[PDB]
Amino acid sequence: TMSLGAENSVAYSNNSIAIPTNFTISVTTEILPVSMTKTSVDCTMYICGD
Amino acid sequence: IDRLITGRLQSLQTYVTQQLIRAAEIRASANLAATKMSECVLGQSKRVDFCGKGYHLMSFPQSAPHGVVFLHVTYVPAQEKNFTTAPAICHDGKAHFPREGVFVSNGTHWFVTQRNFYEPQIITTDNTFVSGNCDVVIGIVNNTVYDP
Amino acid sequence: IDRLITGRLQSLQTYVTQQLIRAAEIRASANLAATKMSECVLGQSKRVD
Amino acid sequence: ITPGTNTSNQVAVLYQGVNCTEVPVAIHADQLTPTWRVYSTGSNVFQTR
Amino acid sequence: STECSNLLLQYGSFCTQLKRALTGIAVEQDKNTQEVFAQVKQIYKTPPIKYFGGFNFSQILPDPSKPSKRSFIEDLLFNKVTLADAGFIKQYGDCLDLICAQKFKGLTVLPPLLTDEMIAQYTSALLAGTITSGWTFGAGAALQIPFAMQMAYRFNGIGVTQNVLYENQKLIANQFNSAIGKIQDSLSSTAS
Amino acid sequence: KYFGGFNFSQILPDPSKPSKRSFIEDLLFNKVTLADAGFIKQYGDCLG
Amino acid sequence: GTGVLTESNKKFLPFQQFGRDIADTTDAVRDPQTLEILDITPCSFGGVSV
Ligand SMILES: *[C@@H]1O[C@H](CO)[C@@H](O[C@@H]2O[C@H](CO)[C@@H](O[C@@H]3O[C@H](CO)[C@@H](O)[C@H](O)[C@@H]3O)[C@H](O)[C@H]2NC(C)=O)[C@H](O)[C@H]1NC(C)=O
Ligand SMILES: *[C@@H]1O[C@H](CO)[C@@H](O[C@@H]2O[C@H](CO)[C@@H](O[C@@H]3O[C@H](CO)[C@@H](O)[C@H](O)[C@@H]3O)[C@H](O)[C@H]2NC(C)=O)[C@H](O)[C@H]1NC(C)=O
Ligand SMILES: *[C@@H]1O[C@H](CO)[C@@H](O[C@@H]2O[C@H](CO)[C@@H](O[C@@H]3O[C@H](CO)[C@@H](O)[C@H](O)[C@@H]3O)[C@H](O)[C@H]2NC(C)=O)[C@H](O)[C@H]1NC(C)=O
Ligand SMILES: *[C@@H]1O[C@H](CO)[C@@H](O[C@@H]2O[C@H](CO)[C@@H](O[C@@H]3O[C@H](CO)[C@@H](O)[C@H](O)[C@@H]3O)[C@H](O)[C@H]2NC(C)=O)[C@H](O)[C@H]1NC(C)=O
Ligand SMILES: *[C@@H]1O[C@H](CO)[C@@H](O[C@@H]2O[C@H](CO)[C@@H](O)[C@H](O)[C@H]2NC(C)=O)[C@H](O)[C@H]1NC(C)=O
Ligand SMILES: *[C@@H]1O[C@H](CO)[C@@H](O[C@@H]2O[C@H](CO)[C@@H](O)[C@H](O)[C@H]2NC(C)=O)[C@H](O)[C@H]1NC(C)=O
Ligand SMILES: *[C@@H]1O[C@H](CO)[C@@H](O)[C@H](O)[C@H]1NC(C)=O
Ligand SMILES: *[C@@H]1O[C@H](CO)[C@@H](O)[C@H](O)[C@H]1NC(C)=O
Ligand SMILES: *[C@@H]1O[C@H](CO)[C@@H](O)[C@H](O)[C@H]1NC(C)=O
Ligand SMILES: *[C@@H]1O[C@H](CO)[C@@H](O)[C@H](O)[C@H]1NC(C)=O
């Protein structure tokens, strides 16, 4: 059975906050298609070759 | 030959329809790519989890065959710490609220710091603005406010 | 029987084309839903309406 | 179900939408792909949704 | 009709691309849910105490008093839509009347990869993240914060000073609870 | 090529290479070219 | 048929007489006269644009 993710519990309270003391600069790639192959078809040859 | 011609014509029509469907899909993808290019490379986008994951800073495009590649530079906070906090500070019967930060205490003394980085500072009248008294806000904690 | 096979095959092809069009529409709707989830649930959006 | 021919050749067979016990598919000889037996008396059979 | 299949074999590989298109559509449908819902790397759990600055979230957080871990709103939505569905059974046990006829013509339905329970778990994790952490969990590790502080900072985001919420918290919580109840009543109404 | 101590040599084009493509762009091209059916360079001379 | 006939590098086996391609096109033929393995390629075509 699939594992959705690691179980996590947040230490929520009336007076409790978590302020980060450091940071990480993260670079992530992202690939997006823009255009595909441009094609043309010749009916006079595809349907009836010679 | 009528039978073969009809079959091949139907096959060509099916191929053209599939090509049109893929053209619509690629058009949508290219529109999304152009929007991301404009909103991440040419500027900073406040849309969370749009230009990469985290707090977006800048994006560098890279050309790819039949597509584009974005290098999203993001600011990811790390190394957090527990901090007792209060919504307001009472000094002389009037409530005080942070200007642009939070109220935190290391267990002994209270401090004000920005929300995205632990940079504690002394509570000062220029770091807070007064609004109302100390009997309408829930969780207000009494503490001195330094006047310079 | 070839006439019947051609008719049935054309009907199946039309059904597949309709399914592809509906799948494209549903994919666009799902992309919009994912964007809305990301921009409104995971954060606060300044976009109007 | 295959892990890729580059890794291993053993495969797992999924029968879509049939109850294992209610449909004793392990008939002797006269089925499509008759060379297939996969009786699997030793290897367990898992019934999924 | 074996001979009909034999003569159809002369039609070339036409069922190949139809099957490929249907499989691609099914994979696309699975990926749609995988992308819209599975946006969190951790399954956050709400604390046992359900007090968040006086706000009431009992109608949207799941409860363990049901076999399916879904909230009241999710149950209302499921009951509203359950008039027409796949059929809830695909194991051929009860099929010897609408799905059976389609199945007898080779028109089957592939079950989704993500069950309703896992989608409900994703929604519950998103609720826990947005309640106990605000927007911080969406950009890294979840950072706890009182719900009143989160709402005050959201007010600051919309251009309203924080003291407004810290002075009208009771009224805002009452308004939010009334709005949630109104949404529940509207969904429970016959007008779907 | 000094930008506040940052390093952009992997994404800026290199004039030494005849094709003005960066290192990452070259990597992307080499990864995609494993399957490229768009042989526009072919013409009627393809009779071998 | 119509096409350009050229010398072929195909190593026809003695029983093999007709060559073919991916899609049912006899791109290689054997001469009924003095033996000669021959390739068949349709002569130059293309699109015309203004
Ligand atoms: C915030 O995070 C950064 C990055 O994790 C911390 O910088 C890191 O600091 C450690 C120790 O100061 C560096 O470790 C070093 O390892 C080499 C390995 O040979 C060793 O020779 C050094 O003596 C040192 O132990 C680590 O390289 C460095 N990381 C980077 C990217 O520079 C920083 O200290 C953190 N700041 C706070 C306040 O937590
Ligand atoms: C919470 O934070 C406050 C403020 O940073 C801590 O108070 C600080 O405690 C240190 C203890 O060494 C004090 O340093 C001492 O300063 C005197 C001069 O006043 C110097 O002569 C000593 O040699 C020593 O360096 C520091 O002054 C003091 N700061 C303030 C503003 O009171 C407190 O200890 C922290 N509590 C916890 C539990 O972390
Ligand atoms: C958050 O909102 C929920 C729903 O509005 C509140 O639960 C509701 O509590 C009231 C009583 O305080 C229930 O009314 C009574 O319920 C009993 C048992 O069902 C019924 O026999 C009575 O005739 C009367 O209707 C109401 O049913 C109940 N609703 C649900 C859905 O459980 C909850 O108390 C609120 N929590 C806070 C902290 O405000
Ligand atoms: C910015 O990043 C580039 C990454 O290409 C750095 O250039 C590369 O730096 C490495 C490490 O110094 C070089 O590797 C070394 O090269 C020398 C000379 O060939 C060799 O003797 C060593 O054994 C080692 O392999 C590498 O050659 C160099 N160039 C490339 C194309 O990788 C660059 O130093 C970074 N900083 C700046 C300011 O550009
Ligand atoms: C956070 O504060 C709330 C304030 O309402 C607490 O909720 C009350 O806690 C008291 C403690 O004895 C109970 O008697 C009440 O029944 C609770 N509810 C209400 C409406 O007053 C809550 O317990 C606090 N949580 C923590 C972790 O301190
Ligand atoms: C924080 O401290 C102030 C004063 O230091 C407290 O103010 C008290 O308010 C009550 C309300 O009637 C008065 O009876 C007391 O006399 C006040 N204290 C003093 C020293 O005069 C305030 O209550 C404190 N906050 C909390 C949450 O206890
Ligand atoms: C804060 O304290 C609580 C309880 O002591 C703990 O569960 C939680 O993990 C702590 N948070 C951090 C960031 O250490
Ligand atoms: C097979 O997998 C190995 C890694 O286990 C890899 O090194 C190898 O290139 C793969 N071969 C093929 C043909 O994919
Ligand atoms: C398969 O059949 C057995 C026996 O009839 C039954 O107990 C079991 O529930 C069935 N499984 C299904 C319908 O998924
Ligand atoms: C006749 O055809 C045979 C076929 O093997 C060939 O060997 C021979 O040289 C041909 N002779 C003439 C005169 O064409």
The string of DSSP letters for E39-72 reads: --SEEEE--S---BTTB--TTTS--TTSSS---H
Mutational test site, ligand 3, from E56, E76, E176, E178, max ligand atoms within 8 Å of CB: E56
**How close C24 comes to chain B (CA, Å)?**
7
Nearest to B145 by CA among B106, B88, B100: B88
Tokens of E185: 């009543």
Query: Is the Cβ pair F47, G44 closer than 8 Å?
Result: no
Interchain CB distance below 8 Å, G47 and A40? yes
Residues of B in contact with C38 (CB under 8 A): 48-50
Cβ contact B130:B95 at 8 Å: yes
Centre of ligand 5 from the C-alpha of residue G33, in Å: 104
> What is the DSSP code (8-state) at residue E95?
-
Q: Which long-range contacts (CB under 8 A, 24 or more apart) does B43-51 make?
A: B46/C46, B47/C39, B47/C43, B47/C45, B47/C47, B48/C38, B48/C39, B48/C42, B48/C43, B48/C44, B48/C45, B48/E135, B48/E138, B48/E139, B49/C38, B49/C39, B49/C42, B49/C43, B49/E39, B49/E138, B49/E139, B50/C35, B50/C38, B50/C39
| C-beta atoms of A10 and E125 within 8 A | no
Residues 6+ away with beta carbon under 8 Å from B65: F28, F29, F32, F33, F36
Contact E143 A19 (CB under 8 A): yes
Is residue E54 within 8 A of residue E151, CB to CB? The reply is no
Token pair for F42: 């072919």
Three-state DSSP class for residue B11: helix
Which of A2, A4, A18 has the CB atom closest to E144's CB atom? Answer: A18
Q: Is G32's C-beta closer than 6 angstroms to any atom of ligand 10?
A: no
Spell out which residues of chain B touch residue E143, defining contact as CB-CB under 8 Å: 77, 80
Residue E112 main-chain phi, psi, to 5 deg: -65, 150
Q: How far apart are the first and last CA of chain F?
A: 49
Contacts of F37 in chain G (CB under 8 A): none
Residue A32, both tokens: 């997006």
Contact list in A for residue G2 (CB cut-off 8 A) is 50
Contact C37 E36 (CB under 8 A): yes
Closest partner residue to E162 (CB to CB) among B54, B78, B97 is B97
Please provide the DSSP assignment of G1-50 as one string. Answer: ---EEEE------SS--B---SSS---EEE-SSS--EEEEEPPP------
Give yes or no for a contact between C2 and E11, defined as CB atoms under 8 angstroms apart: no
Only one residue has tokens 């992309």, namely C31
Question: Rounded to 5 degrees, what angle do the CA atoms E136, E139, E140 make?
Answer: 85
Shortest CA distance from F26: residue in chain B: B64
Chain E residue with Cα closest to A11: E144
Instruction: Residue A11: list chain B partners with CB under 8 A.
Output: 82
Distances in Å between the alpha carbon of B118 and those of A47, B102, B104? Answer: 73, 10, 9
- Give the number of the ligand closest to the Cα of residue B123: 2
G30 in Cβ contact with G12 (< 8 Å)? yes
Give the C-alpha separation, B42 to B59, whole Å.
Answer: 8
E26 CB-contact burial (10 Å; exposed 0-12 / middle 13-18 / buried 19+): middle
Cα angle E131, C29, E26; round to 5: 105
Nearest C-alpha in A relative to B30? A34
Q: Bridge partners of B84?
A: B105
Strand partners, A22: B78
A48 to chain B, any CB pair closer than 8 A? The answer is yes
Cβ <8 Å between C42 and E7: no
> How many whole angstroms from B42 Cα to the centroid of ligand 4?
30
Which member of D19, D22, D49 has the closest CB to residue E111?
D49
Listed residue (E47, E62, E185) closest to E119, CA to CA = E62
* Strand residues in chain B grouped as ranges (E): 55-64, 67-78, 82-85, 89-90, 94-98, 101-105, 110-114, 128-133, 141-142
Answer yes or no: do E139 and B85 touch at CB < 8 A: no
Nearest of D34, G31, B131, B115 to residue E135 by alpha carbon: B115
